[PDB]
Symmetry: D2
Subunit: 149 residues, 4 copies
């Protein structure tokens, strides 16, 4: 039953990584977070952490990914370059629901500079708890994304 | 002249004429090229995402705009194309930073989430905002490129 | 039965039928009462704000919904009425908290800012969410009441 | 030329008050902030600080007010109870512009739990720098709000 959630940031996300770890662990009994870095305020490059989490998720070393930078945008661009990854920029409850229900997203990308802590919590909770719809019309869309990889 | 390829799905279709008009309001140099769909028929967002994205990546167009319900499926699909940096934007800030930091070449928008005046703001801002030119973002962007091989 | 007085200006007018429908989707107990405007003619938001607000404050209606471009003018005008707690909401979270903490009796919405599925989410959430009942919010709310004299 | 900006919070806003003070002082040469409290994490009641700032602004002891709670909603409800106050809940650049340009808002209300720091900065900058439109159609709306006081 344990679902490991790999969490990655840059130095802009770094200052809130502890809260992200908690929001995961409190989202449900089976979710366990693994924070992969970085470990200081030293400037680093978001794609290195994006790609490390996305590759973990793609290989089945983690079930879900969470990435945090200033806006979430760079993380979502980088992570989507990994085959098998569907990385969703979410900024509210509605987008979190749709990312899962329609896109079966396996990575959620968030902006520390844009979205406040209770909303980041709610996004994470929602993303981890919402199932994929299972419907044919969505699946056919997802197969076209996988063909393009 | 900057050619702006515009794509939607059926969910974004009903507002596509307003999107074309927002592009022309961003300035006289912008030439919108709306590539479909041209009716209310249900279609698959990735066909239109990948179409706009491929155009921009091949240099058939300078910038892309993708409109679906939330923006997320468009951003996931577009980013599968090498050379593409597709940014889901939902406000002025994210539109600025997608350009300034990520040199984003495709903006992805949600017709179900984001109201018309904000969509207009985002499009104008996205088209008018330059890349900051800073080497630390450039190195990040080179890392994303390297992950595409 | 809960009567839901609904007001707009000319900017909110074009979506008022969707707002009425979102109210009926929130549950069978909700009865929408749309009080105008009934055409595209330019009107003054405060006339409709104060009208909905006065209805709710006098107990002619249980809840109010006000729609203008951004929500802001509606919230400023409605809150001038004693007994009114009008909340500008733009997502699920704010819709929850307006109810749970502020026991808000009027929700104010922006047709220009917020997309249709989020407006629907907000309305449903606002109508379905109860006040938390906590005494520390009640004391706050009594302080607002005291400032109205 | 000095424009004093009175800033008030509750204990939920308290942890970011320093950043708010800076965002004001850096918004323009003439703006100077005055933080009125609270001064700890001890729980307090948002209406007491809302009403103190709003009354400062209403009496001409400060030119503009800023209020910060979890969502901004309680602050905007309370502050609007003071005659001469037009208190706008803002959550992005667009709402900040409209609050000033259309509503001539003199108080801006913000949510620490909802909106991230770079957006809070941008809202403040925009709110302080944007003039009122001066137009008759807006002024007639504002006179109707003042009649209701």
């Amino acid at each position: 039953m344990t679902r490991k959630v790999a969490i990655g940031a840059d130095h802009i996300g770094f200052p809130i990584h502890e809260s992200i770890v908690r929001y995961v662990r409190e989202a449900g009994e089976e979710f366990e977070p693994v924070y992969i870095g970085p470990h200081s305020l030293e400037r680093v490059d978001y794609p290195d952490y994006a790609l490390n989490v996305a590759r973990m998720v793609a290989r089945g070393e983690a079930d879900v990914g969470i990435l945090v930078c200033g806006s979430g945008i760079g993380m979502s661009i980088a992570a989507n370059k990994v085959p098998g990854i569907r990385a969703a920029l979410c900024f509210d409850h509605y987008t979190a629901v749709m990312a899962r229900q329609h896109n079966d997203a396996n990575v959620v990308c968030l902006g520390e500079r844009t979205t406040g802590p209770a909303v980041l919590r709610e996004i994470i909770m929602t993303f981890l708890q919402t199932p994929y719809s299972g419907e044919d019309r969505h699946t056919q869309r997802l197969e076209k994304i996988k063909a393009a990889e």
